[PDB]
Structures are given as structure tokens and as C-alpha cells.
Amino acid sequence: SGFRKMAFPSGKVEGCMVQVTCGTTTLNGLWLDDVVYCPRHVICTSEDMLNPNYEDLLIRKSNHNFLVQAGNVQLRVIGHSMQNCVLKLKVDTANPKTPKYKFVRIQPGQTFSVLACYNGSPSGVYQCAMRPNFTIKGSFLNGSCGSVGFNIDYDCVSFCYMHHMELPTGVHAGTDLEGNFYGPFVDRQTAQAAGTDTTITVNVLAWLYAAVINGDRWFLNRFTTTLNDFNLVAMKYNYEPLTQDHVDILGPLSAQTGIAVLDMCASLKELLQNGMNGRTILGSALLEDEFTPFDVVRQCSGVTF
Amino acid sequence: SGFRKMAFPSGKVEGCMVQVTCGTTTLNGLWLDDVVYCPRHVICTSEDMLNPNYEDLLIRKSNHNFLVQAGNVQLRVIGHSMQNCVLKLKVDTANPKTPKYKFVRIQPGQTFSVLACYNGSPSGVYQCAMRPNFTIKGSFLNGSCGSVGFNIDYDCVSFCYMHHMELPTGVHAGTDLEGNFYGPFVDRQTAQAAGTDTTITVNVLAWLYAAVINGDRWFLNRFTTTLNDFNLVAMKYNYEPLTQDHVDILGPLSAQTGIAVLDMCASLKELLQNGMNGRTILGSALLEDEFTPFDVVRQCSGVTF
Numbered sequence: 001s002g003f004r005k006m007a008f009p010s011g012k013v014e015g016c017m018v019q020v021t022c023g024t025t026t027l028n029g030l031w032l033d034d035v036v037y038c039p040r041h042v043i044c045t046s047e048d049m050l051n052p053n054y055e056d057l058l059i060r061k062s063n064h065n066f067l068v069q070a071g072n073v074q075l076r077v078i079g080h081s082m083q084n085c086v087l088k089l090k091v092d093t094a095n096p097k098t099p100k101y102k103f104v105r106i107q108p109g110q111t112f113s114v115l116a117c118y119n120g121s122p123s124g125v126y127q128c129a130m131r132p133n134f135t136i137k138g139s140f141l142n143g144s145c146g147s148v149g150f151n152i153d154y155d156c157v158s159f160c161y162m163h164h165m166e167l168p169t170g171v172h173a174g175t176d177l178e179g180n181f182y183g184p185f186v187d188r189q190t191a192q193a194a195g196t197d198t199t200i201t202v203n204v205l206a207w208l209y210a211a212v213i214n215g216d217r218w219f220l221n222r223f224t225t226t227l228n229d230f231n232l233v234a235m236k237y238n239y240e241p242l243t244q245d246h247v248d249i250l251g252p253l254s255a256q257t258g259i260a261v262l263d264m265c266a267s268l269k270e271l272l273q274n275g276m277n278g279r280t281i282l283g284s285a286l287l288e289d290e291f292t293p294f295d296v297v298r299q300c301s302g303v304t305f
Numbered sequence: 306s307g308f309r310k311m312a313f314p315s316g317k318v319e320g321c322m323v324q325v326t327c328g329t330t331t332l333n334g335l336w337l338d339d340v341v342y343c344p345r346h347v348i349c350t351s352e353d354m355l356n357p358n359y360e361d362l363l364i365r366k367s368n369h370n371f372l373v374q375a376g377n378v379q380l381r382v383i384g385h386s387m388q389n390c391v392l393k394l395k396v397d398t399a400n401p402k403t404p405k406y407k408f409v410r411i412q413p414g415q416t417f418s419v420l421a422c423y424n425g426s427p428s429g430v431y432q433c434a435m436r437p438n439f440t441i442k443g444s445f446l447n448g449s450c451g452s453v454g455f456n457i458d459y460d461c462v463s464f465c466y467m468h469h470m471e472l473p474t475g476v477h478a479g480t481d482l483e484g485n486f487y488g489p490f491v492d493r494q495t496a497q498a499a500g501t502d503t504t505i506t507v508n509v510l511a512w513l514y515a516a517v518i519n520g521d522r523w524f525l526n527r528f529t530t531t532l533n534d535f536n537l538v539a540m541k542y543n544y545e546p547l548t549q550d551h552v553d554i555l556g557p558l559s560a561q562t563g564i565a566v567l568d569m570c571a572s573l574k575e576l577l578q579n580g581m582n583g584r585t586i587l588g589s590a591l592l593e594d595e596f597t598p599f600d601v602v603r604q605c606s607g608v609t610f
């Protein structure tokens with residue numbers, strides 16, 4: 001086996017993607033049971049971008065102002081409400097394709113699969129991670145808003161993200177499916193700064209385990225260290241602090257490789273201080289923080305869905 | 306928009322994945338119309354690996370020796386034949402989920418989405434490329450054989466690859482859907498060498514265009530060059546020769562960025578001779594040859610399916 005950025009299969013989420021129009025504004029919705037979820041900025045116009053009062057704009061709006069197309073079949077809107085930054089369009093028909101599902105607020109460092117969508121039509125799927133500045137580094141164009149992030153455990157889709165906007169820096173902001181934004185971002189045309197983005201320490205260590213398990217082991221050295229002393233070095237290279245929970249979570253990988261977590265910390269510390277010398281690990285000249293310990297175990301144990 | 310390794314949505318291929326058993330041997334099949342395709346090495350045992358005579362082994366085999374499970378529903382095998390290195394199991398039921406489809410022999414340098422499968426169940430999807438040594442650098446474990454590679458154009462799935470084996474080097478070999486292997490590899494337990502793997506020049510230039518279009522433009526320089534003179538440098542760094550077809554194919558990207566192909570060749574030549582200095586392009590410290598000019602235009606123009 002090699003090691004790739006691997007998304008979950010996207011079949012169960014394709015059957016939930018719908019087109020939502022209002023005015024000239026067409027973005028993607030998510031149709032679960034008899035409710036279609038999308039970003040509320042659908043109700044905004046060219047003028048209202050700097051300072052929209054969404055409450056006022058939604059007073060001007062009725063069910064018929066909302067065009068839901070699932071493929072060619074138009075859906076009758078019989079209900080509309082505002083949950084934080086998402087619009088909930090109650091429709092006449094329950095999505096027959098509705099999979100078993102949950103909404104989850106994921107933590108910074110967690111990853112998910114994005115099914116990038118245009119006009120309610122899936123174009124593509126890729127894996128990415130909730131950066132520690134609560135931004136995501138996705139691949140989104142004009143029309144992508146409403147595209148969703150998700151994980152699949154057992155038979156159940158956990159929706160964790162809905163895409164709302166690109167920031168000045170060309171990185172992406174969105175909400176969970178209760179429409180609370182990840183991070184400090186608002187759905188306004190306003191100067192907003194994503195903060196310092198820091199490396200996901202525990203994820204890099206997952207990747208080093210992945211590299212070892214693939215027989216890619218040059219960076220392993222003769223040294224160990226302490227959390228406290230590794231954390232001193234991490235903080236210098238803008239790496240997130242490693243907790244004892246983080247160490248506990250790397251257990252399965254520790255056990256499977258016979259390499260103690262704190263040894264691997266020593267290998268990481270050396271790589272940070274010395275760089276890689278133009279060498280590569282799992283075919284990359286940089287250190288990869290977008291694989292969790294779970295992703296590694298799934299990809300390296302072979303979990304199916 | 307950013308730039309990611311982006312697979313096609315995998316919904317239409319999930320509904321085609323089935324489990325094929327024979328003896329202790331369980332691998333994945335592909336169920337199109339009333340025919341289930343899988344690797345013929347399913348009919349082999351622990352002993353027959355060094356030198357199997359597949360013709361002889363298939364004489365010992367009858368329809369009932371083949372267990373096709375689509376989910377929990379078992380399928381009645383009423384037919385079996387050997388097409389090069391693939392087994393064609395004629396079954397009683399036409400797959401109702403069968404999408405519009407084609408089988409294609411793709412060229413070296415072309416890319417596709419792999420839906421990695423275990424026990425007839427999709428685990429994951431990722432993009433990769435037919436290397437110029439006709440190997441692929443995938444993420445496959447024990448049980449993955451029968452997993453397929455594909456592209457989606459319009460509404461039509463083009464199956465291009467079926468996974469058969471991992472080589473000594475941990476890279477992957479397989480066939481098209483008429484069971485002709487890509488490259489010189491045989492479905493035997495024998496010493497087999499994948500040859501020199503060379504960089505896909507035209508794909509790197511697609512990526513440089515992608516980087517520019519994302520506003521990532523440091524490596525652009527004041528120089529131009531000729532094919533002949535760029536090709537002299539490529540061949541030194543084990544880069545595939547660039548043809549005039551390759552230049553023609555980079556047209557849309559040339560036109561969209563206002564940067565002449567041969568200027569970009571000069572930028573590439575400099576990067577090869579000087580390295581990157583610890584700098585990155587589209588968030589990578591290496592040069593990426595697994596995006597075609599099409600992949601870039603899809604991801605950077607926003608094509609849907």
C-alpha cells in the first residue's frame with residue numbers, strides 16, 4: 001500500500017445536492033428529509049454585501065421567491081426560516097435518497113471530504129482539514145457556496161461543514177449545518193483576517209507513523225525527548241502544543257510500529273531544526289499535517305463503509 | 306479557488322462494486338449489464354502463484370465455484386470466460402444501477418480517480434496518474450484487487466484501470482477492462498522490474514499554469530527558450546520529451562494567463578537547475594506532474610458532471 005489524500009466515497013451526498021435560486025443568486029443546497037439547507041447570503045444582492053440586515057431582507061422574501069431544482073424536478077417550498085447563517089427551506093417532498101445522517105461541530109485539526117458543487121451538480125471530491133485558525137484550504141470557484149464537508153462512520157454521514165465564502169487570502173470560511181461559522185468570520189463583504197495558521201503537530205506524527213509503516217524510515221534517529229521539551233521546539237516552528245490525549249490517540253500507531261511516541265517527537269524535532277536536505281517522505285518535500293491518526297489507521301488498516 | 310488533487314464523484318461506480326469469491330480468495334468485481342468483471346488470479350491458490358496455467362485452472366472451475374454477492378443479495382452465475390487477464394462472470398440479473406459507460410485504454414501521463422474497494426465495499430476515492438513506466442502510485446492493501454480507475458465526461462463513466470497486484474517497490478500494476486496489462490507486468494509471483502519513472506513534463510507545466518492562475522508567480526523569470534533546448538535540459542532531469550501536441554494542448558492555459566508556453570519552459574528549466582530554495586508552489590516543495598491540462602481547466606474553469 002502507498003499513502004494518498006483519500007476522500008470517503010461521495011455517492012450518499014450526491015443524492016442530497018440541489019440548486020437553490022433567489023433573484024440572480026444561484027448556489028447549492030442540501031436536501032435532508034423535507035428540509036433544504038443553504039447559506040442565507042442567497043437572499044442578498046450586489047448592493048447589500050457591505051452591510052446586509054438578513055432579518056430585514058428575509059421579510060421581503062416569500063416561499064415562491066425560492067427556486068429549488070433537484071435535477072429537472074422543481075420542488076415546492078412550503079416553509080422558510082433562518083438558523084444562524086443557514087436558510088432552512090421546508091419542501092413538499094422528503095428526499096427518498098436521504099441517507100442516515102448527523103450534524104457535527106468538528107474540532108480544529110479534524111479532517112473531512114468536500115464534495116465541491118456548481119448549480120446543484122457535484123464536480124469533484126477531495127479531503128481537507130479544519131486549520132487551527134478555523135479556515136480551510138479548499139478548491140472552490142464562484143458558485144461553490146452550499147458545497148458541504150462530511151465524514152462517513154458505519155452507514156451514517158456526519159455533515160460537519162457548509163462552504164460560504166473565500167477570504168482575501170484565497171482560503172475558505174464556512175459553517176457547521178446549524179449555521180454557526182467556524183472561527184470569527186461573518187457573511188459580509190468586510191476586511192476579515194484569518195489568524196496565524198499553525199501546524200497540526202499530532203497529525204504530522206500520524207503521517208510519520210504512516211511513512212514508517214510504508215518502510216520510509218530515514219528520519220528515525222537514536223534520541224528521545226519529553227513533551228515539555230518537544231513542546232518548547234514545536235512553539236518555535238508555529239506547531240500546535242502536543243497534549244497527553246494526543247499521545248494516547250497515537251497509541252494504535254505506536255503499538256503497530258513498535259516506536260514510542262516520544263522517540264518520534266525526537267525524529268520530528270530533528271527534522272524541524274535541520275530541514276529534510278532535499279529528501280522526501282511519502283513522496284513530499286514538506287511535512288504533512290492533514291492526516292489524523294484515524295485517517296492513517298483507516299488507510300493503513302483498510303476500514304470500509 | 307485553491308488547487309487540490311480532486312477526484313470525480315464516485316456515486317455511479319459504488320453501485321457497480323460486487324464481491325467475487327472462489328476458494329478462500331475474495332476480491333472485488335465490476336457489475337455492468339449482466340456481466341461481472343474481475344482479475345482472473347481469483348482462480349489461483351497459495352501453490353499456483355509462481356507459475357499458474359490459468360487455462361488449466363479455469364478447466365477445474367464451474368459457475369457455482371464463483372460466489373457473487375452484491376451487498377447481501379447473492380447473484381446466480383450462468384456464464385464464465387477469460388478475456389486476457391480478466392474474468393467475465395455472466396449473471397442472471399442486469400445491474401439496474403448500471404450507468405452509461407465505456408472501456409478506454411488511457412495513455413501514459415493521463416490521470417483517473419481510483420475507488421479503492423475491500424470485500425466489494427468502497428472504502429475511499431483518490432486521483433492518480435498512469436506513470437510513464439506504466440506503474441501507478443496508489444494506496445492499496447490486501448483485498449483491493451478488482452478496485453477500478455475511471456474518469457467521468459458528460460454523463461458517461463470511462464473505466465480505464467482495474468487493480469491486480471503490488472510490485473516489489475510497493476507501486477501498483479493493473480489492466481484496462483479488456484484485461485491487457487498496462488506495461489510489461491504479468492499476473493504471476495515473479496521478479497518484475499518497473500523501469501525508470503520519468504517526470505510528466507506537460508503535466509508540470511499545467512501545474513505552473515494552475516499556480517499562476519492562483520496568483521502564485523515567483524518562479525516566473527525574464528527568459529524564453531526553444532523546445533529543442535528545453536528538451537536538452539528535461540532529458541537530464543529524467544523529464545519526458547515535450548512535443549508540439551503537448552504545446553498545442555497547453556493552449557487554453559497559455560491564452561487564459563497571457564504567458565507563452567516557451568516562457569513557462571524557461572521558468573521550469575531554471576527551477577530544475579536551481580531547485581526551489583525551500584520555497585513552495587501551490588503549497589508543495591516539489592514539482593507536481595499528476596495534473597493534466599484538462600484537470601487544471603476542469604478545476605480552474607469549474608466543469609461539473
Ligand SMILES: *[C@H](Cl)C(=O)N(c1ccc(-c2ccccc2)cc1)[C@@H](C(=O)N[C@@H](C)c1ccccc1)c1cccnc1
Nearest residue numbers: 041044049140141142143144145164165166187188189
Ligand atoms: C458563493 Cl456561490 C460564492 O462563490 N462566493 C460568494 C460568497 C459569499 C457572497 C455574499 C455573502 C454575503 C452577502 C452577499 C454575498 C457572495 C459570493 C464567492 C466569494 O466568496 N467571494 C468573496 C470574495 C466574497 C466575500 C464576502 C462577500 C462577498 C464575496 C466565491 C468564490 C470562490 C470560492 N468560493 C466563493
Ligand SMILES: *[C@H](Cl)C(=O)N(c1ccc(-c2ccccc2)cc1)[C@@H](C(=O)N[C@@H](C)c1ccccc1)c1cccnc1
Nearest residue numbers: 346349354445446447448449450469470471492493494
Ligand atoms: C489482491 Cl486482493 C491483492 O490484494 N494482492 C494480490 C495480488 C495478486 C495475487 C495473485 C496473482 C497471481 C496468481 C496468484 C495470486 C495475490 C494477491 C496483494 C498483492 O498484490 N501482493 C503482491 C506482493 C503479489 C504479487 C504477485 C503475486 C502474488 C502477490 C496486494 C497487496 C497490497 C496492495 N495490492 C495488492
